[PDB]
Design an enzyme around this catalytic site. Structure first.
Site, PDB file in Angstrom:
ATOM      1  N   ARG A   8     130.142  60.016 -27.990  1.00  0.00           N
ATOM      2  CA  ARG A   8     130.578  61.322 -28.531  1.00  0.00           C
ATOM      3  C   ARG A   8     131.144  60.715 -30.120  1.00  0.00           C
ATOM      4  O   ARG A   8     130.675  61.397 -31.131  1.00  0.00           O
ATOM      5  CB  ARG A   8     131.978  61.880 -27.925  1.00  0.00           C
ATOM      6  CG  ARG A   8     132.384  63.113 -28.423  1.00  0.00           C
ATOM      7  CD  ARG A   8     131.268  64.191 -28.090  1.00  0.00           C
ATOM      8  NE  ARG A   8     131.827  65.324 -29.164  1.00  0.00           N
ATOM      9  CZ  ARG A   8     130.722  66.192 -29.459  1.00  0.00           C
ATOM     10  NH1 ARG A   8     129.450  66.081 -29.021  1.00  0.00           N
ATOM     11  NH2 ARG A   8     131.212  67.207 -30.297  1.00  0.00           N
ATOM     12  N   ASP A  20     123.994  52.448 -26.483  1.00  0.00           N
ATOM     13  CA  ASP A  20     124.596  53.245 -25.287  1.00  0.00           C
ATOM     14  C   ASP A  20     124.236  52.885 -23.813  1.00  0.00           C
ATOM     15  O   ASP A  20     123.635  51.852 -23.679  1.00  0.00           O
ATOM     16  CB  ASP A  20     124.636  54.674 -25.679  1.00  0.00           C
ATOM     17  CG  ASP A  20     125.615  55.643 -24.816  1.00  0.00           C
ATOM     18  OD1 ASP A  20     125.502  55.719 -23.664  1.00  0.00           O
ATOM     19  OD2 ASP A  20     126.415  56.150 -25.574  1.00  0.00           O
ATOM     20  N   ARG A  80     127.421  44.473 -20.900  1.00  0.00           N
ATOM     21  CA  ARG A  80     128.693  44.125 -20.251  1.00  0.00           C
ATOM     22  C   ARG A  80     129.581  43.183 -21.013  1.00  0.00           C
ATOM     23  O   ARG A  80     130.870  43.144 -21.067  1.00  0.00           O
ATOM     24  CB  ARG A  80     128.569  43.812 -18.862  1.00  0.00           C
ATOM     25  CG  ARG A  80     129.792  43.636 -18.016  1.00  0.00           C
ATOM     26  CD  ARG A  80     129.801  43.558 -16.494  1.00  0.00           C
ATOM     27  NE  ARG A  80     129.070  44.766 -15.882  1.00  0.00           N
ATOM     28  CZ  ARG A  80     128.979  45.016 -14.816  1.00  0.00           C
ATOM     29  NH1 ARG A  80     129.723  44.319 -14.007  1.00  0.00           N
ATOM     30  NH2 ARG A  80     128.267  46.274 -14.257  1.00  0.00           N
ATOM     31  N   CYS A 106     142.978  58.853 -33.893  1.00  0.00           N
ATOM     32  CA  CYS A 106     142.699  59.940 -34.665  1.00  0.00           C
ATOM     33  C   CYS A 106     144.141  60.600 -34.948  1.00  0.00           C
ATOM     34  O   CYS A 106     144.271  60.971 -35.955  1.00  0.00           O
ATOM     35  CB  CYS A 106     141.852  61.041 -33.759  1.00  0.00           C
ATOM     36  SG  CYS A 106     142.365  61.087 -31.817  1.00  0.00           S
ATOM     37  N   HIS A 115     147.111  68.754 -28.713  1.00  0.00           N
ATOM     38  CA  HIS A 115     145.701  68.163 -28.849  1.00  0.00           C
ATOM     39  C   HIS A 115     144.464  68.818 -27.920  1.00  0.00           C
ATOM     40  O   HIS A 115     144.892  68.918 -26.775  1.00  0.00           O
ATOM     41  CB  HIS A 115     145.549  66.584 -28.722  1.00  0.00           C
ATOM     42  CG  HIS A 115     144.648  65.571 -29.160  1.00  0.00           C
ATOM     43  ND1 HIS A 115     143.330  65.542 -28.498  1.00  0.00           N
ATOM     44  CD2 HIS A 115     144.793  64.964 -30.076  1.00  0.00           C
ATOM     45  CE1 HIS A 115     142.732  64.770 -29.455  1.00  0.00           C
ATOM     46  NE2 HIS A 115     143.549  64.473 -30.293  1.00  0.00           N
ATOM     47  N   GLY A 148     151.070  56.500 -28.292  1.00  0.00           N
ATOM     48  CA  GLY A 148     151.447  55.538 -29.019  1.00  0.00           C
ATOM     49  C   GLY A 148     151.233  55.481 -30.671  1.00  0.00           C
ATOM     50  O   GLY A 148     151.473  54.826 -31.125  1.00  0.00           O
ATOM     51  N   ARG A 194     147.914  68.011 -24.354  1.00  0.00           N
ATOM     52  CA  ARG A 194     146.371  68.322 -24.160  1.00  0.00           C
ATOM     53  C   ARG A 194     146.194  69.705 -23.938  1.00  0.00           C
ATOM     54  O   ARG A 194     146.719  70.014 -22.629  1.00  0.00           O
ATOM     55  CB  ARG A 194     145.713  67.663 -23.406  1.00  0.00           C
ATOM     56  CG  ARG A 194     145.688  65.947 -23.791  1.00  0.00           C
ATOM     57  CD  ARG A 194     145.039  66.114 -25.246  1.00  0.00           C
ATOM     58  NE  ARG A 194     144.359  64.511 -25.658  1.00  0.00           N
ATOM     59  CZ  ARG A 194     143.491  63.860 -25.120  1.00  0.00           C
ATOM     60  NH1 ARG A 194     142.897  64.635 -23.756  1.00  0.00           N
ATOM     61  NH2 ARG A 194     142.802  63.004 -25.751  1.00  0.00           N
ATOM     62  N   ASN A 209     139.888  66.150 -34.509  1.00  0.00           N
ATOM     63  CA  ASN A 209     140.070  64.733 -33.837  1.00  0.00           C
ATOM     64  C   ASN A 209     138.781  64.055 -34.124  1.00  0.00           C
ATOM     65  O   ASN A 209     139.029  62.616 -34.081  1.00  0.00           O
ATOM     66  CB  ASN A 209     140.310  64.781 -32.454  1.00  0.00           C
ATOM     67  CG  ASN A 209     140.199  66.281 -31.983  1.00  0.00           C
ATOM     68  OD1 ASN A 209     140.872  67.113 -31.928  1.00  0.00           O
ATOM     69  ND2 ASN A 209     139.154  66.036 -31.117  1.00  0.00           N
TER      70      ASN A 209
HETATM   71  N1  NAD Z   1     138.709  62.898 -29.949  1.00  0.00           N
HETATM   72  C1  NAD Z   1     137.912  61.784 -30.095  1.00  0.00           C
HETATM   73  O1  NAD Z   1     136.801  61.974 -29.815  1.00  0.00           O
HETATM   74  C2  NAD Z   1     138.289  60.290 -30.574  1.00  0.00           C
HETATM   75  C3  NAD Z   1     138.884  60.173 -31.810  1.00  0.00           C
HETATM   76  C4  NAD Z   1     139.447  58.995 -32.348  1.00  0.00           C
HETATM   77  C5  NAD Z   1     139.266  57.737 -31.701  1.00  0.00           C
HETATM   78  N2  NAD Z   1     138.614  57.917 -30.266  1.00  0.00           N
HETATM   79  C6  NAD Z   1     138.314  56.533 -29.554  1.00  0.00           C
HETATM   80  O2  NAD Z   1     136.928  56.389 -29.602  1.00  0.00           O
HETATM   81  C7  NAD Z   1     136.483  55.676 -28.394  1.00  0.00           C
HETATM   82  C8  NAD Z   1     135.060  56.627 -27.847  1.00  0.00           C
HETATM   83  O3  NAD Z   1     135.784  57.851 -27.725  1.00  0.00           O
HETATM   84  P1  NAD Z   1     134.748  59.061 -27.688  1.00  0.00           P
HETATM   85  O4  NAD Z   1     135.161  60.429 -27.853  1.00  0.00           O
HETATM   86  O5  NAD Z   1     133.559  58.886 -28.473  1.00  0.00           O
HETATM   87  O6  NAD Z   1     134.247  58.956 -25.983  1.00  0.00           O
HETATM   88  P2  NAD Z   1     132.803  59.280 -25.120  1.00  0.00           P
HETATM   89  O7  NAD Z   1     133.626  59.027 -23.897  1.00  0.00           O
HETATM   90  O8  NAD Z   1     132.312  60.639 -25.677  1.00  0.00           O
HETATM   91  O9  NAD Z   1     132.133  58.042 -25.766  1.00  0.00           O
HETATM   92  C9  NAD Z   1     132.073  56.710 -25.566  1.00  0.00           C
HETATM   93  C10 NAD Z   1     130.583  56.445 -25.221  1.00  0.00           C
HETATM   94  O10 NAD Z   1     130.348  54.951 -24.591  1.00  0.00           O
HETATM   95  C11 NAD Z   1     129.142  54.747 -24.146  1.00  0.00           C
HETATM   96  N3  NAD Z   1     129.401  53.449 -23.162  1.00  0.00           N
HETATM   97  C12 NAD Z   1     130.394  53.160 -21.942  1.00  0.00           C
HETATM   98  N4  NAD Z   1     130.188  51.998 -21.762  1.00  0.00           N
HETATM   99  C13 NAD Z   1     129.371  51.419 -22.438  1.00  0.00           C
HETATM  100  C14 NAD Z   1     128.917  50.191 -22.701  1.00  0.00           C
HETATM  101  N5  NAD Z   1     129.265  49.143 -21.765  1.00  0.00           N
HETATM  102  N6  NAD Z   1     127.833  49.998 -23.815  1.00  0.00           N
HETATM  103  C15 NAD Z   1     127.364  50.876 -24.506  1.00  0.00           C
HETATM  104  N7  NAD Z   1     127.792  52.190 -24.265  1.00  0.00           N
HETATM  105  C16 NAD Z   1     128.778  52.324 -23.501  1.00  0.00           C
HETATM  106  C17 NAD Z   1     129.380  56.173 -22.986  1.00  0.00           C
HETATM  107  O11 NAD Z   1     127.967  56.295 -22.560  1.00  0.00           O
HETATM  108  C18 NAD Z   1     129.779  57.024 -23.763  1.00  0.00           C
HETATM  109  O12 NAD Z   1     128.984  58.078 -24.299  1.00  0.00           O
HETATM  110  C19 NAD Z   1     137.652  55.854 -27.320  1.00  0.00           C
HETATM  111  O13 NAD Z   1     138.487  54.542 -27.426  1.00  0.00           O
HETATM  112  C20 NAD Z   1     138.463  56.906 -28.123  1.00  0.00           C
HETATM  113  O14 NAD Z   1     140.005  56.729 -27.781  1.00  0.00           O
HETATM  114  C21 NAD Z   1     138.067  58.952 -30.155  1.00  0.00           C
HETATM  115  O1  S70 Z   2     144.533  61.829 -29.163  1.00  0.00           O
HETATM  116  C1  S70 Z   2     144.733  60.852 -28.776  1.00  0.00           C
HETATM  117  C2  S70 Z   2     145.992  60.346 -28.087  1.00  0.00           C
HETATM  118  P1  S70 Z   2     147.013  61.875 -28.098  1.00  0.00           P
HETATM  119  O2  S70 Z   2     146.357  63.018 -27.578  1.00  0.00           O
HETATM  120  O3  S70 Z   2     148.447  61.166 -27.123  1.00  0.00           O
HETATM  121  O4  S70 Z   2     147.297  61.989 -29.496  1.00  0.00           O
HETATM  122  C3  S70 Z   2     143.325  59.898 -28.784  1.00  0.00           C
HETATM  123  O5  S70 Z   2     143.869  58.530 -28.137  1.00  0.00           O
HETATM  124  C4  S70 Z   2     142.017  60.274 -28.050  1.00  0.00           C
HETATM  125  O6  S70 Z   2     141.693  59.178 -27.095  1.00  0.00           O
HETATM  126  P2  S70 Z   2     140.451  59.463 -26.016  1.00  0.00           P
HETATM  127  O7  S70 Z   2     140.494  57.972 -25.245  1.00  0.00           O
HETATM  128  O8  S70 Z   2     139.073  59.691 -26.790  1.00  0.00           O
HETATM  129  O9  S70 Z   2     140.559  60.684 -24.942  1.00  0.00           O
END
Ligand code: NAD
Ligand code: S70
Ligand code: NAD
Ligand code: NAD
Ligand code: NAD
Lengths: 359, 359, 359, 359
Positions: free
Chosen positions: A12, A38, A92, A166, A194, A227, A249, A335
């Site tokens: 994502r 990925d 991994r 975020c 959120h 946090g 959430r 976000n």
């Molecule tokens: N709201 C948000 O989307 C958001 C905003 C800010 C920060 N983040 C942080 O960013 C990170 C990713 O969030 P996200 O929303 O994209 O989640 P997501 O689950 O949508 O994306 C993570 C992706 O990683 C891939 N993946 C898993 N293990 C893997 C591996 N070993 N090698 C390669 N690819 C692998 C999965 O296929 C998955 O699509 C998290 O740590 C999250 O806390 C998310």
């Molecule tokens: O918004 C977040 C935490 P909050 O809702 O307590 O502000 C952020 O960590 C999203 O993480 P994900 O691992 O992509 O769900």
């Protein structure tokens, strides 16, 4: 010169960081995304995913696929406007990535499985020189928030750093204006309504690390500790141990909003804070903090690149009249979008600050 | 003597199956649930999942936890009004389950990963006699549908049977009344507007085997192919090759609806069919086939335990006037609830038939 | 030669019809919006509703407001891209609108309360020439469908038309190809998974005219009758009384899909039908009929101006093999976007023919 | 002599009050519902609305209809579990009501059109003794929150009262325990993550008194100025001008949660508070204030009938460690169910009081 980037975990956020680059026009120009990585290596599937997005619309650039070698089954290479992004086989152990052979020096760690300082440092062995965790880290990794403290970045000390979260990138810019403008922050509590994310579930399911988080997401208001407000301290040491907050959430696929309540360090007025926020959005926080005085609702912030969008009317209308210390500030943020752009920014800022240190 | 039962995979259906057991006063009498199995053995957390349900509300019966033996770290035993249930640690391979050492002979295979006759037979090697698969199976497993062909159970020839799918279970009852009352089915195409499930994603995520199935689940009408309609050929052979359908996964956490279109084998009327269905639900299909004539919506079917609830008004009001061959039949079902009662209904049947084979 | 138009009922479809014009660069040029109308005349609120949309994104053309005489309390003029629109006062009788003085000949009637021939004719007495009912009419009003029978428009006979229903505009294009490509339709029943609309309720409420329609819209699957399948007969007489169907209102703000099951006049295959649809879309139905061969979901058709988007994959994958008569056609549609565009199309066509009709 | 009550405005709330009233088992015994008054008299449609509920499940008692006199067109009598209730034809003026003739002394105001003290006084002239407006009231009508200040009910002084709002009935109990237990409230800001209500719209529609409130409800987070907080200054005068807050309408049909933040009037800890609330819920707040220490989500509060359900875990885990003044308190409430029960509570209270002051 182009920045050889490698996106780890094209999920994502992975796809949103990539689409950030494109939107800003840094592909095959300022940033050279040499390879994403990925689960599989089905470029045709990666295309479809980038091409169509439930919330953010249709990708503006046409996407196509091709083979890296005529001796390949399914297309393994992604093509975005002349540029060719390779889809390598996931790993991994980051220490086992062909970053060195590929020529990648900056990797955006967005799998979610390598937020540990030393876990992310594995990318360095792989041949990379800098890593940016797209989430809160652990292990003394330096945390940087664009428009707040990204200048503290140090080319020779910081090789594995975090763009934070975020929510942190949404709150930080407000606390920062408050402290830098002299209002001050004695103590503060924040809540973030959120929208659910990929970690949550469609129907009630097993989630040992967060019982409430396993419940049907799209039909529940799920509370959670965060946090984020406490991480503000890392970026603004003066507010260390002065803030904390939770998250509710709720049933929306994207966009969230910060609800800050604090006690100013000195006496002021809400009008004063309102004016200080807008003034900085047009000056030193431009592109990071923005604002609005229109009756907007979550959907109106979709695809906004600011890290925080102060809601003037929601703020000016819901505080105590004539109050001099007890205040509430409301701010929005997509976000997904905002943060994703900050990822590109931090990376860019580092490459420039890395160039200087050398040549 | 109660029959020792063990539930592998304690989730949406594993839990609803249990709740159905408590509800019909079978726990500790007809059935003795020796143990359930999921990710861990934290009974305390199992209680929480059983206690609160987003769609079926608060578990009406009290549930506490205790220890199998003092040498256990945290509680590992669920206690539902005197009836004690052991939480065993999930198993990558079914053959590695301590059935033969527990006393369990029947295991409701509901983890969702062992629907392959061969892979599910591992429960037999673990020390169990029979295994009911809570989903369409493969490998030759005999497929039974209560009220339709469940009497074709051969105590000595079937050890790993499939209770079919939730949809097949809503469709069959109808196609059976049609075929049995002599209306006949020349050709039929079904469409199930199915509410989402645990295999779907909250936000656009990775799903290589079902692309559309990876897109956001609570903000999209997601199309999908289904076997449910075809499977009706296995339960009622005279229809084999005459039906097939598709599913549209829409934004609802539970309860689905079958939209069956078909041409009868003889000249009939929607009235004759309408009256044939209600009559059947009061007679030989009682308990399995239900029906309504009220202006109901999906939520009204929540917790209804029938396998199919014929919607009289929807059907009569939406067919061609005077038509004698081409008809549409609408029938609801709580994809979670009813099917779970059927799983218990099936096991119970099998128990009697296994008791009368050697006696 | 700016065509003169007057939108009555500036709401969901009224605004969409306007954003329909602009999108095609018809504002000021081909078409000239003299004045719109709704409950109030607050241009600031109108401008607001236009600027931001929950499903269709942000309006791409700056909108501001001014006056027509300082003697006005609040801005009552809507300046959209230099072109200025007037906000007239709402009337309980279409005949009370100053259409005559306003110099407005064509009037897009989208209030939804005058779908009656006579009722809408109130627009003609007010001084207007032609009145298009952005909805199914009644009382002997000629129903047209761009790309299916819209040429049947008699400039000197039809002064009040009906652009039909958003659903008929999706079904007809499909049925029209079947009939014309010689396939023929003997009998057909159609079901539409439709997303909720402004007529439904957020939470259970009063709806004496439709009991189910008065139930929490965003959390239920509400069944509903519909005359769209029966209306095709008014547009494609060959099908008169040979088609009908229902609706299933699911939890989504926009986008719907047709699920037509029918028997062909002669023998064929799903391939031949699939091939004809793709052909018709690229030729005599281009702009109206489109198709897709991609794994798309509801949200992917947001902002698609075609009237019907045939889903190739979902169709080839869910029919009976080697079957020659019984078939299922799956076609999508942005019930809000596409339709609005057809409204303008019918208006521009009526002008084109009206013009030459006496010039 | 069971109390003779009459409900004015049998809408979503008129029913909830009657269902709650039935739940307590007061129908026929303590209270006696004479007649309900709504726009239409269709009793079959009333029995329907009472029989099924999208969120609160199915009504537990039987509902049928008859006629009060053989000389009646359609059914005018609603028969609930034997008890008889007449459906009188609505009105726009509270005077034209036959309360006195009907022998109705207590009338429940839920039409939402007579929240004014002067307006709602019509019932009194309608032979009706007392009036309890189930919503905030104006014209200086006396407000009463069960468990907070209901003992300030002076029979011979107050004849037309208000039961305040749903949010206030959640905040008041919390603030009352804080003030009465020694902590005190210096300044405080509240926020209610509230689920959408009937006044909201399915899709973007016209809403002149609340622009954001006109946006699609089940797909947005709509902010909103609220009074509840300030209305607490009426129930607990000491907090006059000390509190206020806003609201975030999220995508859920029912259940909301209050997130209050404030500074105590003395030094304490989040533990003292936590203990004080739990102690109160068990003693003097029993029935009104309740609490939980489990990992609950909104769905788990559906049908809870307390006015406020304090979230111990969510509170203790999200406050600043060792803090003494600045605190956050999280409290849940079935915004529909709790309040409904409170309405019955206020009426039952008033009755008994009126009985002793009159007898
Ligand atoms: N709201 C948000 O989307 C958001 C905003 C800010 C920060 N983040 C942080 O960013 C990170 C990713 O969030 P996200 O929303 O994209 O989640 P997501 O689950 O949508 O994306 C993570 C992706 O990683 C891939 N993946 C898993 N293990 C893997 C591996 N070993 N090698 C390669 N690819 C692998 C999965 O296929 C998955 O699509 C998290 O740590 C999250 O806390 C998310
Ligand atoms: O918004 C977040 C935490 P909050 O809702 O307590 O502000 C952020 O960590 C999203 O993480 P994900 O691992 O992509 O769900
Ligand atoms: N929910 C429905 O509508 C429905 C209806 C009918 C049939 N089914 C079928 O029932 C089965 C389960 O579906 P569900 O809805 O309960 O899904 P679920 O995901 O809610 O249940 C699966 C459970 O199994 C546990 N699990 C995973 N791997 C395991 C292992 N190796 N050992 C033990 N436990 C393991 C998971 O933690 C989870 O709780 C599937 O085969 C599904 O196709 C589902
Ligand atoms: N949105 C769709 O899916 C759709 C598609 C095709 C056709 N239609 C038809 O179009 C009509 C309107 O649909 P909609 O979605 O725009 O509904 P809507 O309720 O959103 O819009 C109608 C608007 O008319 C205004 N209005 C009411 N009475 C009025 C009067 N006397 N004068 C002026 N304005 C008045 C209201 O303020 C309202 O906003 C209906 O008849 C519907 O059946 C709807
Ligand atoms: N349950 C809650 O969420 C809640 C809580 C506290 C206060 N309130 C307030 O209580 C009032 C009613 O709440 P609700 O949930 O029932 O709202 P609603 O909009 O769902 O119901 C109002 C009903 O009143 C009926 N009505 C209107 N005018 C009438 C008249 N003159 N005579 C007879 N019937 C008439 C209508 O048929 C309508 O269905 C509103 O003013 C609301 O703000 C609601």
């Amino acid at each position: 010169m182009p920045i050889k980037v490698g996106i780890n975990g094209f999920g994502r956020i992975g796809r949103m960081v990539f689409q950030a680059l494109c939107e800003d026009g840094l592909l095959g120009t300022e940033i050279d995304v040499v390879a994403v990585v990925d689960m599989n290596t089905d470029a045709e599937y990666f295309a479809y995913q980038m091409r169509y997005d439930t919330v953010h619309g249709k990708f503006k650039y046409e996407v196509t696929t091709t083979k890296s070698s005529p001796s390949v089954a399914k297309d393994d290479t992604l093509v975005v406007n002349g540029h060719r992004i390779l889809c390598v086989k996931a790993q991994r152990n980051p220490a086992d990535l062909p970053w060195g052979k590929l020529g990648v020096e900056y990797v955006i760690e967005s799998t979610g499985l390598f937020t540990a300082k030393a876990a992310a440092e594995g990318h360095l062995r792989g041949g990379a020189r800098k890593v940016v965790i797209s989430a809160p880290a652990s292990g003394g990794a330096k945390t940087l928030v664009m428009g707040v403290n990204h200048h503290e970045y140090n080319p020779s000390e910081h090789h594995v750093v975090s763009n934070a979260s975020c929510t942190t990138n949404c709150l930080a810019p407000i606390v920062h204006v408050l402290v830098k403008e002299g209002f001050g922050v004695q103590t503060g509590l924040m809540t973030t309504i959120h929208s659910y994310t990929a970690t949550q579930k469609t129907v009630d399911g097993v989630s040992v690390k967060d019982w409430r988080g396993g419940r049907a997401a799209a039909v529940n208001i799920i509370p959670s500790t965060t946090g984020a407000a406490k991480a503000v301290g890392m970026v603004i040491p003066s507010t260390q141990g002065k803030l904390t907050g939770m998250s509710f959430r709720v049933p929306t696929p994207d966009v969230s909003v910060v609800d800050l309540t604090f006690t100013a360090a000195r006496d002021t007025s809400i009008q004063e804070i309102d004016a200080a926020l807008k003034r900085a959005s047009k000056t030193y926080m431009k592109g990071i903090l923005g604002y609005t005085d229109e009756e907007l609702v979550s959907a109106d912030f979709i695809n906004d690149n600011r890290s925080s969008i102060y809601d003037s009317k929601a703020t000016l209308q819901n505080n105590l009249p004539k109050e001099r210390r007890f205040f509430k500030i409301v701010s929005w943020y997509d976000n997904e979008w905002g943060y994703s752009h900050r990822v590109v920014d931090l990376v860019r800022h580092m490459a420039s600050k890395d160039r200087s240190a050398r040549l």
